[PDB]
Amino acid sequence: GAPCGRISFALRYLYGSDQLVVRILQALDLPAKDSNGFSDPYVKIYLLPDRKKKFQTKVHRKTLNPIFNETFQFSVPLAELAQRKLHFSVYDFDRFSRHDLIGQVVLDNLLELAEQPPDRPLWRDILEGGSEKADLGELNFSLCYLPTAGLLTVTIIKASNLKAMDLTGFSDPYVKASLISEGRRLKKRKTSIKKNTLNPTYNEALVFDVAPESVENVGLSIAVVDYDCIGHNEVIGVCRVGPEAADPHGREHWAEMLANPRKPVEHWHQLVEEKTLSS
Ligand SMILES: [Ca+2]
Ligand SMILES: [Ca+2]
Ligand SMILES: [Ca+2]
Ligand SMILES: [Ca+2]
Ligand SMILES: [Ca+2]
Ligand SMILES: [Ca+2]
Ligand SMILES: [Zn+2]
């Protein structure tokens, strides 16, 4: 996707000193946030679930393609790397105004990313999507279409930094994928109701019958929902995927679902407030 800004880096994990190292290299095609058509980008870094534990890059002014070249060390036992996530928040720095969020990226299982290779840099697209003091969360899922059989399969993988929705302290999240074509909702499908977490893992496949002469014109709206009871469930966040999707990243994902027929494509998406789209 063209209008989709992205950032590159590299990371290795020195055992024997239990240290996750992370080099932020450079970003490209960042969104402008200044009236001058640019941004003064810098990136906050977290290592979930540790919410405070942040590093910050220098604040490169006037550029949509910063070259950070900064490195950061984290003390994590090998046993913990799996139960852990990196999380970058890209921001535009501002003098006279609240700093503008450019986007966020979530780094899934850190172990595998680091274990190899070294200085073949890896890229992730910066997830544009509203984030007030309270972020709704990111949702990870695959996407695989068998044209020969008309099976389109979603497969909800996991979610990160969901919004707490219960007084108890968390949310009892499940995921509602629903087929959309030309504004009409055609078919819904739910997942398990994993309870009392904000970083759920599903690995559950949702499947839809869709003719090959029709995929191009269909799409789906996924939405993480906090269970509550009987019929009073309250939504946490939503995300579109398919043509006619607001976010380029949203339709680039459906775009590459086709073009790679029997291959599942994994991608992170930013959960966004329900009232910024409309079926
Ligand atoms: Ca600005
Ligand atoms: Ca600025
Ligand atoms: Ca501002
Ligand atoms: Ca609730
Ligand atoms: Ca509960
Ligand atoms: Ca609940
Ligand atoms: Zn993208």
Side-chain angles (χ1 to χ4, degrees), residues 102-273:
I102 291 171
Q104 299 179 330
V105 320
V106 188
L107 279 189
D108 205 352
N109 60 352
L110 303 169
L111 193 277
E112 296 203 337
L113 277 71
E115 206 167 18
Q116 258 145 52
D119 239 2
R120 282 187 25 155
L122 44 148
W123 300 74
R124 293 287 179 282
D125 298 340
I126 304 178
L127 306 158
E128 273 150 280
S131 169
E132 313 170 356
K133 184 180 177 181
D135 182 20
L136 303 181
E138 297 71 48
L139 170 80
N140 191 28
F141 60 81
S142 77
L143 226 56
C144 187
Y145 181 66
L146 308 322
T148 22
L151 288 197
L152 156 139
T153 332
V154 201
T155 315
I156 307 305
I157 308 178
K158 57 205 306 170
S160 160
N161 192 5
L162 255 31
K163 188 212 192 76
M165 295 293 314
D166 299 299
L167 287 186
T168 77
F170 304 115
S171 305
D172 304 27
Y174 67 106
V175 190
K176 179 195 304 175
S178 22
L179 208 56
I180 291 185
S181 182
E182 311 191 60
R184 165 153 302 201
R185 187 270 262 167
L186 308 158
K187 252 294 187 73
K188 80 154 56 183
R189 201 67 54 92
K190 302 172 186 281
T191 80
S192 166
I193 338 289
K194 299 302 167 51
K195 37 192 51 190
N196 288 330
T197 183
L198 277 160
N199 295 28
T201 302
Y202 296 97
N203 284 312
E204 309 177 19
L206 309 185
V207 205
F208 297 89
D209 285 312
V210 174
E213 70 269 21
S214 279
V215 258
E216 304 213 7
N217 197 6
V218 84
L220 61 173
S221 162
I222 327 293
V224 174
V225 190
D226 170 45
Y227 176 94
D228 262 19
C229 71
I230 291 69
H232 281 103
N233 308 325
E234 46 194 66
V235 175
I236 298 180
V238 196
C239 65
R240 253 64 177 195
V241 87
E244 218 74 47
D247 193 341
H249 181 58
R251 43 195 162 82
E252 91 169 24
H253 184 201
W254 225 77
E256 68 188 52
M257 182 201 57
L258 305 329
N260 297 72
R262 322 183 97 241
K263 163 185 157 93
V265 303
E266 188 176 334
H267 271 302
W268 281 96
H269 291 282
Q270 174 81 74
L271 293 181
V272 199
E273 276 288 350

Side-chain angles (χ1 to χ4, degrees), residues 33-34 92 94 96-100:
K33 292 307 190 175
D34 311 354
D92 165 68
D94 269 308
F96 302 84
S97 182
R98 192 182 194 93
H99 289 52
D100 291 337

Side-chain angles (χ1 to χ4, degrees), residues 27-76:
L28 303 178
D29 297 329
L30 280 187
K33 292 307 190 175
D34 311 354
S35 293
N36 70 3
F38 291 74
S39 294
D40 306 350
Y42 67 92
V43 25
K44 290 173 177 172
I45 297 180
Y46 307 92
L47 186 124
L48 313 188
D50 204 350
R51 278 186 158 255
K52 291 174 276 194
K53 190 176 171 68
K54 56 166 166 183
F55 289 102
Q56 268 197 17
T57 57
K58 291 174 65 191
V59 197
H60 294 57
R61 27 264 303 192
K62 266 231 297 179
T63 183
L64 295 192
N65 318 255
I67 289 177
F68 298 102
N69 275 355
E70 297 173 51
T71 320
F72 308 86
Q73 325 210 340
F74 288 94
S75 201
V76 197

